[PDB]
Symmetry: C2
Subunit: 616 residues, 2 copies
Amino acid sequence: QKAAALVDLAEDGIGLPVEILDRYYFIFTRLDLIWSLNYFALLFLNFFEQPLWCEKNPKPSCKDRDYYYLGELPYLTNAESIIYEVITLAILLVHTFFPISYEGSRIFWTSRLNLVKVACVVILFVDVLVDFLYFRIAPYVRVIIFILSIRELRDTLVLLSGMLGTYLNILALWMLFLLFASWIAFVMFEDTQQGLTVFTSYGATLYQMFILFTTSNNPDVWIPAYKSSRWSSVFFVLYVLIGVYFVTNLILAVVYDSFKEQLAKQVSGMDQMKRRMLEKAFGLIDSDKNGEIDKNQCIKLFEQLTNYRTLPKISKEEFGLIFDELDDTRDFKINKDEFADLCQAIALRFQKEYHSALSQQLRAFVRSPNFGYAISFILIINFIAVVVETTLDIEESSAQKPWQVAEFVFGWIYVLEMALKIYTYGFENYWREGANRFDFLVTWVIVIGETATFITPFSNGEWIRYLLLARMLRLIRLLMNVQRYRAFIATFITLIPSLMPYLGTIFCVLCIYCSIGVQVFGGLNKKLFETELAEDDYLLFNFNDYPNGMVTLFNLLVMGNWQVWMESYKDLTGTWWSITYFVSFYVITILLLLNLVVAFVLEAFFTELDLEEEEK
Amino acid sequence: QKAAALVDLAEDGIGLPVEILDRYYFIFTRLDLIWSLNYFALLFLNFFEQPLWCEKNPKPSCKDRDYYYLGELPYLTNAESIIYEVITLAILLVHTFFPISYEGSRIFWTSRLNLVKVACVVILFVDVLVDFLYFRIAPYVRVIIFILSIRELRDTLVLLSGMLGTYLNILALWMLFLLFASWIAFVMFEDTQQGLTVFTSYGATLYQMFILFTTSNNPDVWIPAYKSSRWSSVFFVLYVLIGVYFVTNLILAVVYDSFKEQLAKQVSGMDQMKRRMLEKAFGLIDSDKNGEIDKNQCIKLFEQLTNYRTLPKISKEEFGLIFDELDDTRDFKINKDEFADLCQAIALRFQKEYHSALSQQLRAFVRSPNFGYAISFILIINFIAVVVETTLDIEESSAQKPWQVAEFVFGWIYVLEMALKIYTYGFENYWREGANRFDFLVTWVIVIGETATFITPFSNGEWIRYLLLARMLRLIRLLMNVQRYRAFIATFITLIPSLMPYLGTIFCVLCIYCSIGVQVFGGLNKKLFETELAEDDYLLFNFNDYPNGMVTLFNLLVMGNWQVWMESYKDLTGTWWSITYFVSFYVITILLLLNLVVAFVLEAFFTELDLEEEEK
Ligand SMILES: [Ba+2]
Ligand SMILES: [Ba+2]
Ligand SMILES: [Ba+2]
Ligand SMILES: [Ba+2]
Ligand SMILES: [Ba+2]
Ligand SMILES: [Ba+2]
Ligand SMILES: [Ba+2]
Ligand SMILES: [Ba+2]
Ligand SMILES: [Ba+2]
Ligand SMILES: [Ba+2]
Ligand SMILES: [Ba+2]
Ligand SMILES: [Ba+2]
Ligand SMILES: [Ba+2]
Ligand SMILES: [Ba+2]
Ligand SMILES: [Ca+2]
Ligand SMILES: [Ca+2]
Ligand SMILES: [Ca+2]
Ligand SMILES: [Ca+2]
């Protein structure tokens, strides 16, 4: 009946899942709940197509492919590129044809998102056939399509814009600070030592003061001036003090507040949609369209929410006397708004979510705490076994087999545990809790490890087995029982998945800034390449290939000696208008995104503290 | 009368100033309000006695004093040390004898603070006479005496302890993280490349992973492992990601919350004392000790608070009808608690604080906005004049006199402004607003500059004049009229004095960590000193002298290539138990104090936003 349809709607809205219509929509979404899973791997592989792709560097140039400090394995032949791109674009084409099913023809192409999706698809197609028969913006539309493909990154982008609004203003003020400070600094050391300051007039001093602002060149950049006079330092310290602890911090504060504001905006935009779900449910169960529901119409919805969703109580005549007790007046009173708060309160404060003989013997013992204690002690002896095997491999006193085979059969004990636990709990019930999913993937990489190690053909054993000691990382959850380190560990655990859309966003930003590196900074040998610098002759073993560009972009992201990539390339291309790359990168990923994730970590920790204080 | 005494008490308690008694106390505190000013300069000079003092390095050793990359001017002869220390200790002795006057004999020596003060004094004495007739902990008791000398740093220390409590716990968890990560990393690269990892077994890997945790060696420390295999990076990035953005951030969060808590505790401890002041006032004006005050006893206190403190209204029979209106019932009703809220509300929402012919002509025109506009335009043309003089000095096309003499007479216009403004407003009224004090000190360094430049005897002109263009920094206050950059600038302005006790605290911490450097790391030439490192042969132009040790401590504080001081000294002394210095420093001044000031900047900015939102 319509009532049951409601129960599904209320339970789904409670689970925060929802559609966007108003039985085609139903059955089509049901067809989507499986296709989305393959679509995820599709998007991830299509994204990984970009780093595995060939480059524009070996393209009509000599003499590829050798090792002029450029490249790491592997690459892609143009044919494999063709077929792979064709496959991914085909499944993607299906993934773009599919949402038109549970939508109107004039409705689908009307949304700002879908038309952009299709546009990126036809761009990727008009580029895949051309790239086949024959390449610039081709990798860009891949990461672009990917970012908007997943809503949990789309919302993040909306957020980021919503704060970049004022972030531009605080950036302008920062720019003013830089300009003035650089001017005063330049006019301070004009007709004295040294040459590194005066070398390229004012612009050089602005450049170097900007690099001093990130403190990635602090001891050195004013070292000659300090050698001249010691009191010179009194300037620079004052510049750092006022620069890093005063300015940068309140920049972080600006990004903080802006983020919090836009986030409150986002969840405010979420509650409205959820309310739309609940009001849809009530609107459907209210056949008379009076705006209210009666007990003879309410206890059935309650009963359905009991039988199909959560567990409250039992409905009898006692229930009738209960409804007759709340007012000693009748009948009956529940409206469109009280119903929502009732559903929310029930879903919140109350509970949530073959022969029955041979299986029920284990289905009652696996739910017992004895099983958890079993796998606990198992991962303990697993720990001591692993640390022994490893501590004997480092002493080369092996005697490696009797322990590593034991860790293999430990992996077998883990796949046994995983199998019986995924069997006794459920197909989707075991998949709901994320920890069990982590254990699921760890196990399912352990077994493909077993296929790769035992079936077809040592050191590979040590490698592909010791890495999966992260299965024993769940033993650290024990520390939450201590009121000293509870909030910390809990915050971390809740941070692992919640910080993921931001990390993924900035990762995609890196994947966007890498294509720029391949397209512009292809050429790395030469006279310039060997001239400067010292460790830069070692540090520049990258940014020529794509994974190299990615990991050196990481090296920029940690701000560890980052400027050595900025300057060594500056005099590698010749033009100063190359550094505009680096700066931009910084000002996009250091003063914005990293401050954002700092803000989010802080806010998450405070939320955890407020939760622990709430339950007190 | 007693009532007037109250008015002074309520006004002082409102101004947050207070004593600690219960007319000796009165007159003695009045004698203190002037002595404290000299005591400040006394404490500052006594503190500056430490960096100007001699060292333990030239003490019975050869061959001082040359330039073996050790030392900057100036120093102190032992005789000058004797007389200076004697003077400072004498005035300090007076400053310790003085508080015993307005206190009880059995009361003074009973307080935990005073006895420690006197103890430090007699230590400084039993050390000054010995150091005279002849030196280890002598500089320590100076900074120690100084920190507790000023309450505004004492409270900061209390705060710091109150948070270091749990900060120890989060530090322990961090230690665990380091240990485990270092172990797994070490066992990852055991029987492969390279040597930098295995060199000193596990401890070396813990050391290097710890230096990777501060990201001050990120590209390099795993560079050989990356040269071996590219996939090795996949480890380290995961270590940095999980290390810097997950751990360090919630460490900052811990310090944040702890700080906020202890601060709320502190201001809570402040309001209690203020309430004690107000309750003292009411308790004194309530002669009958009934706990309440009548209108015929209240309008006189009101009248006194009008005539001597702030400005409300006028008291007539209309006032009597007003009191007869609030209830149409009498008489009369004000108790000990309502009086406090009344005083607070009046002091908050309402206002706050020779022939009268020749002077009153200027005393009415200086208060006009035309004067502010005058000095504004004056500092504008001052700006263009200064930028012209400076931009012609850098072109060596001078023609320097006609502009620099104009900036001198500009300084004269500023001392004229300062004189007439300090004359027309008041002796202490001009001193209340901090901005006018900044202008006062700028002016009063400009005039001693005039004494040093014009009276006794160029480039010295340029130097000692261009530096005081910070008098034109008040032109940046104009930006607050823009609703884009208002909160930022305002926050900064309010941060300049409020962040000062923390900066002073960490500065004193540096001054404590410097004596350790002089006493332990005296010896810097040698074989070790020239061996490592490259830029470290240039970077180690310090930490031998005291100001050198201070500025290189600054170089450590900014975490710019800090580890090069840590390692170069490690193999300069030989023992690893020297690095325990550096680490400690870090873990005291980077994970605690700097996170504290970050938290404080953020909190200040948020407070500013809440204020601007409040007035909306
Ligand atoms: Ba010059
Ligand atoms: Ba000059
Ligand atoms: Ba250089
Ligand atoms: Ba930082
Ligand atoms: Ba109605
Ligand atoms: Ba459970
Ligand atoms: Ba619990
Ligand atoms: Ba170097
Ligand atoms: Ba080995
Ligand atoms: Ba091995
Ligand atoms: Ba090395
Ligand atoms: Ba009473
Ligand atoms: Ba005023
Ligand atoms: Ba105003
Ligand atoms: Ca292709
Ligand atoms: Ca109805
Ligand atoms: Ca002395
Ligand atoms: Ca009374």
